[PDB]
Amino acid sequence: PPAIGQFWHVTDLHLDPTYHITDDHTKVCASSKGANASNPGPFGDVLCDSPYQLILSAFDFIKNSGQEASFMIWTGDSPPHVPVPELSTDTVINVITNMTTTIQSLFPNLQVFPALGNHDYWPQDQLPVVTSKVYNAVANLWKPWLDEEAISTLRKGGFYSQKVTTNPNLRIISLNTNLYYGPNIMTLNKTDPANQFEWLESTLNNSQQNKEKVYIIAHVPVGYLPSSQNITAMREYYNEKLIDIFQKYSDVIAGQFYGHTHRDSIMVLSDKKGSPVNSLFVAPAVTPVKSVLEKQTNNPGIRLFQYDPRDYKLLDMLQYYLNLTEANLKGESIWKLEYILTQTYDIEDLQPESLYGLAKQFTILDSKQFIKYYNYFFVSYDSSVTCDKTCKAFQICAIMNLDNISYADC
C-alpha cells in the first residue's frame, strides 16, 4: 500500500488523584485501600492506580515517539479503584473532564474516539439505559471530536457512531458494553438495554450499504476471560447476541478493540460454519494496579495500530510499555517498544485467518509462541512468568471460542 494509516489505542488510565510519595506507605494512594504500597515511586506502584505523572508520561511519549497518527481510540475507565462511597458523580465527572482536557491540550488537532468504561459512572458498573448527568457531561466534553448525531446518542445511552475526519468512509462505532456487564443491576432482565442492539444492527446495515468499513470500540469485551473457566465478562445472553450480530456483519467490521481486563489478548471470531472472520484486540491498561494477593499485574501499556487506508484492513500493531520498576528506580519515563505483532509472531498481518493460524500454533505442545504470548499478556511484568496446562487451556480456548458451545467444546 502506498501509504500507511495509524491510530493509537489507550485504555484504562484510572487516575488516582490521591497519589503522592510519603513515608506512610499506607497513605500513598487511596487505591491501595489501606495496604502498604509496595515500593512506590514517581511513576506509580503496583498496589496503586495511576498517578497523574504516569498518564502525562504516556501522552508525552506519544507526542515525542515520532509516530504520526490520524486518530486515537480511548476505551474508558478514568476514575480509580476506590470504594464506591469515597467517590461520587461529581468526582467521577471531574476525573473524566481532567483526562479529556489533558488529551485535548496535548493533541489539539487529533480526533479521538472515546468509549465509556464501567468505572466512568457513579456508582461504578451501574450504567443506565436512559440519559444521566454523566452521559450529558461526556457529550459536552467530547463535542470537539464528535458530530451532533453522535452527541445525541451519547446523551441517551452512552454509545455513538462517528465517521473519521481523515477517512470519512471509515466509521467508528463506540459501544457501551457496560450495559451488558455482569454486575450492572440496572439492565437486569432487559432484552435490549438502551436499544443498543437495534441501533447497532441498523448502523451496521447502513454502513454496509454506504460502502463503509467499521471499527468497533468498547470497554468490556465479548467472549471468555482468559484466566478463568466458563466466565464471560458480559452476561452470556448479551455475549451471544453480540456474537451473532458481529457474525452477520463480519464483512463490514474490519476490527474490534476493547479494554477492561488490563491485559494484552486477542480473540478470533468465527462464523457459524467455523471459518474465522473478525479479529479482536484487547489492549492492556496504563494503570499497573493489582490486589495484594495477585502475583502478576501488567506494566503500563500504550499501543499503535497500522491500517491500509483503502479498505481499512489491519496491517500491524506496535505495543509500547513502561518498565515500571526501571522507571521508578531511575526516576525517568522510559517508554519502550515491547513488540511489533507481525515481527514477533511471523504472520503476514492482522486479518482473521492470520490470527487464527497464530492461535493454532499456540496449541503446539510446549509452543514457544504461546509462551511469548503469555509474557506479553502481562505486558512483560515478569519474564520468568511460567504457565501451567490448565491456564493454557483457558487462554487457548478463549482466544478461539467466543460463544458458549464452542468454548465448552474446547
Ligand X SMILES: *[C@@H]1O[C@H](CO)[C@@H](O)[C@H](O)[C@H]1NC(C)=O
Candidates 66-74, 95-103, 310-318, 385-393; binding stretch for ligand X (CB under 6 A): 95-103
- Amino acid, single-letter form, for residue 213: K
Q: Where do we find the cell 489505542?
A: 9
Candidates 19-27, 112-120, 124-132, 372-380; binding stretch for Zn ion (CB under 5 A): 112-120
CB neighbours of residue 46 within 10 Å: 23
Nearer to Zn ion, 77 or 338 (CB): 77
Task: Answer yes or no whether residue 147 interacts with ligand X by CB under 6 A.
Answer: no
- Amino acid, single-letter form, for residue 76: G
Candidates 97-105, 211-219, 362-370, 392-400; binding stretch for ligand X (CB under 6 A): 97-105
- The answer on whether 81 is annotated among ligand-binding residues is yes
- Alpha-carbon separation of residue 362 from 261, 282, 356, 400 (angstroms): 21, 18, 10, 11
In which region does residue 43 sit, left (phi positive, over 0), alpha (psi from -120 to 50) or beta (all else)? alpha
Shortest gap between Cβ of 20 and ligand X (angstroms)? 10
Say which entry of ligand X, Zn ion, none residue 354 contacts (CB below 5 to 8 A, set by partner kind).
Answer: none
Say which entry of ligand X, Zn ion, none residue 12 contacts (CB below 5 to 8 A, set by partner kind).
Answer: Zn ion
Task: Answer yes or no whether residue 16 interacts with Zn ion by CB under 5 A.
Answer: no
Say which entry of ligand X, Zn ion, none residue 118 contacts (CB below 5 to 8 A, set by partner kind).
Answer: Zn ion
Task: Answer yes or no whether residue 287 interacts with ligand X by CB under 6 A.
Answer: no
Task: Answer yes or no whether residue 332 interacts with ligand X by CB under 6 A.
Answer: no
Which residue stretches of 255-401 are H helix? 324-330, 341-345, 352-362, 368-377, 389-400
Say which entry of Zn ion, ligand X, none residue 186 contacts (CB below 5 to 8 A, set by partner kind).
Answer: none
Q: Which of 39, 101, 205, 230 binds ligand X (CB under 6 A)?
A: 101
Question: Quick one: cell of 89?
Answer: 458523580
- The answer on whether 25 is annotated among ligand-binding residues is no
Task: Answer yes or no whether residue 75 interacts with Zn ion by CB under 5 A.
Answer: no
Shortest gap between Cβ of 203 and ligand X (angstroms)? 33
Say which entry of ligand X, Zn ion, none residue 303 contacts (CB below 5 to 8 A, set by partner kind).
Answer: none
Task: Answer yes or no whether residue 102 interacts with ligand X by CB under 6 A.
Answer: yes
Measured CA angle at 101 (ends 98, 106), to 5 deg: 125
Task: Answer yes or no whether residue 270 interacts with ligand X by CB under 6 A.
Answer: no
Question: Quick one: cell of 324?
Answer: 515500571
Which residue stretches of 229-338 are H helix? 236-248, 324-330
Task: Answer yes or no whether residue 329 interacts with ligand X by CB under 6 A.
Answer: yes
Task: Answer yes or no whether residue 301 interacts with ligand X by CB under 6 A.
Answer: no
Distance between CA atoms of residues 218 and 22, nearest Å: 37
Closest CA to 47 of 21, 70, 65, 29: 29
- The answer on whether 14 is annotated among ligand-binding residues is yes
| Residues near Zn ion (CB under 5 A), total | 5
CA atoms 81, 175, 236, 296: torsion sign: negative
Q: What is the CA radius of gyration of the chain?
A: 20
Q: Which of 6, 33, 52, 361 binds ligand X (CB under 6 A)?
A: 52
Shortest gap between Cβ of 275 and ligand X (angstroms)? 36
Say which entry of Zn ion, ligand X, none residue 325 contacts (CB below 5 to 8 A, set by partner kind).
Answer: ligand X
CA atoms 297, 234, 50, 39: torsion sign: negative
Shortest gap between Cβ of 102 and ligand X (angstroms)? 5
Binding residues for ligand X restricted to 367-396, rule: CB under 6 A: 380, 383
Give the 3-state secondary structure percentages of the chain, helix then strand then coil, rounded to 5. 35, 20, 45
Three-state SS for 23-37 is CCCCCCCHHHCCCCC
Close Cβ partners of 249 (under 8 Å, ≥ 6 residues apart): 201, 204, 205, 207, 208, 214
- The answer on whether 260 is annotated among ligand-binding residues is yes
CA atoms 259, 263, 268, 269: torsion sign: negative
Strand bridging mode 71-74 / 5-10: parallel
| Residues near ligand X (CB under 6 A), total | 16
Shortest gap between Cβ of 130 and ligand X (angstroms)? 29
Question: Quick one: cell of 349?
Answer: 498481518
Q: Rule CB under 5 A: which residues touch Zn ion?
A: 12, 77, 117-118, 260
Question: For binding to ligand X (CB under 6 A), which residues are involved?
Answer: 17, 25-26, 34-36, 52, 98, 101-102, 323, 325-326, 329, 380, 383
Annotated binding residues for Zn(2+), written as ranges, equal: 12, 14, 77, 118, 219, 260, 262
Annotated binding site for ATP: 81, 118-119
